[PDB]
Amino acid sequence: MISLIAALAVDRVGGMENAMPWNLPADLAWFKRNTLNKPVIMGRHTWESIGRPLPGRKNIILSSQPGTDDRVTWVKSVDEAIAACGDVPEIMVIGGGRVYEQFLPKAQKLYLTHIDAEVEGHFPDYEPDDWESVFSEFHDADAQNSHSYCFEILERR
Ligand SMILES: Nc1nc(=O)c2nc(CNc3ccc(C(=O)N[C@@H](CCC(=O)O)C(=O)O)cc3)cnc2[nH]1
């Protein structure tokens, strides 16, 4: 099965630019916990932004061009990315926007972090009627985390 994992802020005319609006180590810990020992699929730009393989996961990068780093697995289509994962329980698609769009119709589960920051203007719109919330938990900002956030897991209805 295919899952998407992403961090989401509120869309708002007059909000911050999307360059770097939050700092959430707690969110990266949730990301790690829910991706470890699963294959992760990402687009080339997301790969270049992370800048190093995610340890303890099979890293699969989508690019139309040949690969340029032997530390990861390179694929040229969505179907090839899925086939590269083999027979596993859960494939994690980690971004970015173009990649989420292509995989959302295939996905059974969404792991979402709803961050209480307003940004003017990555994740596709999803029909709330087609998804059922199965886990959610709110957390206050703290000394290490700039904003409050809510983890949520949605499964197809
Ligand atoms: N919830 C969510 N949060 C994100 O920040 C996120 N980011 C991406 C793309 N960007 C990134 C950037 C850096 C790392 C990263 O360094 N992760 C380390 C964790 C740090 C820790 O807790 O020690 C890793 O091992 O996963 C991951 C994803 C995709 N979906 C997301 N999903």
Deposited resolution, Å: 1.4
In terms of CATH architecture, what is 1-157? 3-Layer(aba) Sandwich (3.40)
- From residue 139, give the alpha-carbon distance in Å to each of 18, 118, 145: 22, 17, 10
The structure was resolved experimentally with X-ray
CB of 8 within 8 A of CB of 115? yes
Calculate how far, in angstroms, residue 28's C-alpha sits from the geometric centre of ligand 1: 5
Q: What are the extents of the domains in the chain?
A: 1-157
CB of 40 within 8 A of CB of 88? no
Calculate how far, in angstroms, residue 40's C-alpha sits from the geometric centre of ligand 1: 11
What's the 3-state SS for the chain? CEEEEEEEEEEEEEEECCCCCCCCHHHHHHHHHHHCCCCEEEEHHHHHHHCCCCCCCCEEEECCCCCCCCCCEEECCHHHHHHHHCCCCCEEEEECHHHHHHHHHHCCEEEEEEEEEEECCCCCCCCHHHEEEEEEEEECCCCCCCCCEEEEEEEEC
Q: How far apart are CA 71 and CA 54, in angstroms?
A: 10
Q: How far apart are CA 118 and CA 101, in angstroms?
A: 22
Q: Hey, which of 31, 99, 109 would you mutate to test ligand 1's pocket, going by the most ligand atoms within 8 Å of its Cβ?
A: 31
